[PDB]
């Protein structure tokens, strides 16, 4: 008859690090009974290695170093099979398993390979803003890697907060999540979060409120990380002595484009930046009492919510500002020094010191004499409730981002803020910086992390775009949020 | 002795659609050997679910039948330990797996639970650019669903075609990858894509060009979907005959200005929206002959290309175009009736609609007496070669698809173009706009899928972005183009 040889793989598919899969090798056309069987791989953009061989019957077995006590190889000469059992496997396992059989055939002189099945092992995943570090906290993976042969990837999808949401809940998305903790009760009201299982050593290493912050329903649902809150930061050497208040704000605009600069850019888009003035002299989201966030009680269209946001609308009336300007624009200007200040939080601070722009950081200004009252974020890292990594995102977590080391990498990349470790926190207080981001986050309130605060996001957002914009009236605008 | 009664689930972990996992129970502090044992499950956002029960011996078994025929119940009592055999599994099966017995503990009246453990099995997902009709593509998925019970995800990742070279390079991405064809050649120099295998009446369905356009080294590497080309969109109310020539342009947005309008904007910051005029008097990418594209030939400093841009950036220095503008800043301004034209490709024409404007699509202008000519892109849906689910996403791509049903459902979200499929685009080819489209598609050039073409994109972007912004001059912004 004919030769009809053929080796055929089955059994790869998709597994998590640390996990196990059993392939299988059915062989035929030739007297497999005889034979050593082998088993390769081959990844993309890497050569060919060989991973495993058996003898005949099965007593005498092999083994490539790279698999060496993780692999066992074995057969079955009633079925013609033969079969690689893969345990502990990790992403630098990720291939296409090939079959092999070698010196058969005609003449005895020819070799065979089956199609292939493909092995695919993800690395740990973590989304993370893109104005973060994103680039430090993969050094930190690059470590974690390194001592685990775990590989680790940082994501920085567009619009991951709203992202995360939808595809935890569709059962997937990445293993780790870092936001704002405001986020987070949202998604520990829907179960995408993972009780998080640090012990009362590793929680005393930071400071009580970051913990409270990530505290839900008593349950706590995320590492803090670290405390963000706006500041004023200006150009010393266009601006040596920056004004105190939003009044002033005007005049040194004019004084200003007298000389072909501005005063004052910023991000207009996002409500986060717009927030601390219309706090200022009143306005609030949620009302706090008795233990619990009143929701029925809604402090967007009172008095001094209004006179905050009239006074930005007259600022861009007046042509001081421009309601398209959004982060990218207000950063350009301010980099390239075409505006005196912007308004922005830690992470920041990195651009502008490749800028060379002699910059300081300060407080906000007051408006009728209020501080302004930004919204202290607690960057904050949840474990998917659908991650099948969670012991390992707990590893990377604990011992590997919440330490000297580790904040510092993500830190020398974009400047986090106050951080949540004590040890690392008392380091970085000397700042000039720091200091002025914690005077005025102690100025402000703490974002609540209740599920509402979603809505609340989205309504903000939208009376502030309108009522700049000339769509909506200031009081249009913050009626349509307060329902 | 105490009640120590404890049961330990293990065994979970990722797995994809129509694999397989071995579940286990270890259970101590009470007599195992006499109780019946169960599995159960609970998914967040869904009640627990029964799943299964064995017997004290083991010969008794009882299933859901949401699983029956699926799972397999086991016990070793040698091991006081009972297993749960899944196998087709599907992305409707994730959740957290229980161990549970009951009537136990003091006075045979307890219930006790293990901590569980998480099982999950992500569903198909395929990535598509955010302009295109990707939640008409999500209908097409839902179908897929209801036929296979497996989920379909598709998302538009921000820059997914910088994306997926680096995550398919990790070892992980989509399933599947839609993008026009210039970019496939990339991918699969790289090893990223599998080889797709159509059988040949498979072929006969789509036009023998567009299969030419995903072929790469001899391979069929994605599935051709329709065929796209930019053309002059025109607002039939503010303009009743569009131009036939450039040269027409700056008067007409004179007198339009003088009515508080414009008469031309489109995307300044893609070089896809700028090529067919730059190419329209002698621009080109990679000369091609004798059956290759000659890499070492690069037409993008020649003077027909400087032609092409020096009136584009004339028309910008004349204030009849902005630097800045980019696509959502054209689409807002055409589809308010701003702007009495734009250019832009069957993708857009849905928002147009839902604009209410009444609109004709034709003809891009001459310059120089020359036909604009446009790049012409075949999107195509391509194979990760890392993806787990191969087979499932052929039927996908084959059988649901590139069927008369699946890109009607696809074309109602957003018009695909001249559709690859050859039933289906004769019953689009009456559409005066797809005709318009077939036009300035023959008037143009297919783009090479060669790996170079990235590289390529990249110098044109950065030679028009800095020639319109004033940072180079023409000829300074395409020498350096040319390197
Ligand atoms: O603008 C509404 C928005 O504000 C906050 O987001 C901040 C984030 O906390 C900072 O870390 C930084 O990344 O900028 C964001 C604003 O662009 C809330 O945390 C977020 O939930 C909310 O949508
Ligand atoms: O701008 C360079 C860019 O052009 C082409 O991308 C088109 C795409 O083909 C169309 O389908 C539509 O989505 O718009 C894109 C331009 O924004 C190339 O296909 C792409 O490789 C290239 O980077
Ligand atoms: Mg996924
Ligand atoms: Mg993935």
């Known amino acids: 008859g004919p030769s009809q040889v053929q080796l055929v793989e089955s059994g790869g598919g998709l597994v998590q690090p640390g996990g196990s899969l059993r392939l299988s090798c059915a062989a035929s056309?030739?007297?497999?009974?005889?034979?050593?069987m082998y088993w390769y791989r081959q990844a993309p953009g890497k050569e060919r290695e060989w991973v495993a061989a058996?003898?005949?019957?099965?007593?005498?077995?092999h083994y490539a170093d790279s698999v060496k006590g993780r692999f066992t190889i074995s057969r079955d000469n009633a079925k013609n099979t033969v079969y690689l059992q893969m345990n502990s496997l990790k992403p630098e396992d990720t291939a296409v398993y090939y079959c092999?059989?070698?010196?058969?055939?005609?003449?005895?002189?020819?070799?065979?390979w089956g199609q292939g099945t493909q092995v695919t092992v993800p690395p740990l995943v973590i989304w993370i803003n893109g104005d973060k570090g994103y680039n430090g906290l993969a050094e930190v993976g690059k470590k974690f890697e390194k001592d685990t042969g775990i590989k680790v990837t940082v994501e920085h999808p567009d619009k991951l907060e709203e992202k995360f949401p939808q595809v935890a809940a569709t059962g997937d998305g990445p293993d780790i999540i870092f936001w704002a903790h405001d986020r987070f009760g949202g998604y520990a009201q829907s179960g995408l979060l993972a009780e998080i299982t640090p012990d009362k050593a590793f929680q005393d290493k930071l400071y009580p409120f970051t913990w409270d912050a990530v505290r839900y329903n008593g349950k706590l649902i995320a590492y803090p990380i670290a405390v963000e809150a706006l500041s004023l930061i200006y150009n010393k050497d266009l601006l040596p002595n920056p004004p105190k208040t939003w009044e002033e704000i005007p005049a040194l605009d004019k004084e200003l484009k007298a000389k072909g600069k501005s005063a004052l850019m910023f991000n207009l888009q996002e409500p986060y930046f717009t927030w601390p003035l219309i706090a200022a002299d009143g306005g609030y989201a949620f009302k706090y009492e008795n233990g619990k966030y009143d929701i029925k009680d809604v402090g967007v269209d009172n008095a001094g919510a209004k006179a905050g946001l009239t006074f930005l609308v007259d600022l861009i009336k007046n042509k001081h500002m421009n309601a398209d300007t959004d982060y990218s624009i207000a950063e350009a200007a301010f980099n390239k020094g075409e505006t005196a200040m912007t308004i922005n939080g830690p992470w920041a601070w990195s651009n502008i010191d490749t800028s060379k722009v002699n910059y300081g950081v300060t407080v906000l200004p007051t408006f009728k004499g209020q501080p302004s009252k930004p919204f202290v974020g607690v960057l904050s890292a949840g474990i998917n409730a659908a991650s099948p990594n969670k012991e390992l995102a707990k590893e990377f977590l604990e011992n590997y981002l919440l330490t000297d080391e580790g904040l510092e990498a993500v830190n020398k990349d974009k400047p986090l803020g106050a951080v949540a470790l004590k040890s690392y926190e008392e380091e970085l207080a000397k700042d000039p910086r720091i200091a002025a981001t914690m005077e005025n986050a102690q100025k402000g309130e703490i974002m609540p992390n209740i599920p509402q605060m979603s809505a609340f996001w989205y309504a903000v957002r939208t009376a502030v775009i309108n009522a700049a914009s000339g769509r909506q009236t200031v009081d249009e605008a913050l009626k349509d949020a307060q329902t | 002795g105490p009640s120590q009664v404890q049961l330990v689930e293990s065994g979970g972990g990722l797995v994809q659609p129509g694999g397989s996992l071995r579940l286990s129970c270890?259970?101590?502090?009470?007599?195992?050997?006499?109780?019946?044992?169960?599995?159960y499950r609970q998914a967040p956002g869904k009640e627990r679910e029964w799943?299964?029960?064995?017997?004290?011996?083991?010969?008794?078994?009882?299933?859901?039948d949401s699983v029956k025929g699926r799972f397999t119940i086991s016990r070793d009592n040698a091991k006081n330990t009972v297993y749960l055999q899944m196998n087709s599994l599907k992305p409707e099966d994730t959740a957290v797996?229980?161990?549970?017995?009951?009537?136990?503990?003091?006075?045979?009246?307890?219930?006790?639970?293990?901590?569980g453990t998480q099982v999950t099995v992500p569903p198909l997902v395929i990535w598509i650019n955010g302009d295109k009709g990707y939640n008409g593509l999500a209908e097409v998925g839902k179908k897929f669903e209801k036929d296979t019970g497996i989920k379909v995800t598709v998302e538009h990742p921000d820059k997914l075609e910088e994306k997926f070279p680096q995550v398919a390079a990790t070892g992980d991405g989509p399933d599947i990858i839609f993008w026009a064809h210039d970019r496939f050649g990339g991918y699969a120099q790289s090893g990223l894509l599998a080889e797709i295998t159509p059988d040949k009446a498979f072929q006969d369905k789509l036009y023998p060009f567009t299969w030419d356009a995903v072929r790469y080294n001899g391979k069929l590497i994605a599935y051709p979907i329709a065929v796209e080309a930019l053309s002059l969109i025109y607002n039939k109310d503010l303009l009743p005959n569009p131009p036939k020539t450039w040269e027409e342009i700056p008067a007409l947005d004179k007198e339009l200005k003088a009515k508080g309008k414009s008469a031309l904007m489109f995307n300044l910051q893609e070089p896809y929206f700028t090529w067919p005029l730059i190419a329209a008097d002698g621009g080109y990418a990679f000369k091609y002959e004798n059956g290759k594209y000659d890499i070492k030939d690069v037409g993008v400093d020649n003077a027909g290309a400087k032609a092409g841009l020096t009136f584009l950036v004339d028309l910008i220095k004349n204030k009849h175009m902005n630097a800045d503008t980019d696509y959502s800043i054209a689409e807002a301004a055409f589809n308010k009736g701003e702007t009495a034209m734009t250019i832009n490709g069957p993708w857009a024409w849905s928002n147009i609609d839902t604009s209410k404007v009444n609109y004709g699509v034709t003809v891009l202008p001459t310059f120089k007496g020359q036909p604009s000519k446009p790049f012409v892109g075949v999107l195509s849906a391509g194979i990760n070669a890392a993806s787990p689910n191969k087979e499932l996403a052929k039927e996908f791509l084959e059988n649901y698809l590139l069927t008369d049903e699946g890109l009607e459902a696809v074309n109602k979200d957003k018009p695909l173009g001249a559709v690859a499929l050859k039933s289906y685009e004769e019953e689009l080819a009456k559409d005066p706009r797809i005709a318009a489209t077939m036009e300035n598609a023959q008037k143009g050039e297919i783009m090479p899928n060669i790996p170079q073409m990235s590289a390529f994109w990249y110098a044109v972007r950065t030679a028009v972005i800095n020639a319109a912004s004033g940072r180079q001059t023409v000829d300074e912004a395409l020498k350096d183009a040319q390197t």
């Open positions: 058996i003898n005949s019957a099965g007593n005498e077995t």
């Open positions: 056309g030739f007297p497999v009974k005889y034979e050593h």
């Open positions: 092999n059989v070698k010196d058969i055939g005609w003449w005895a002189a020819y070799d065979y």
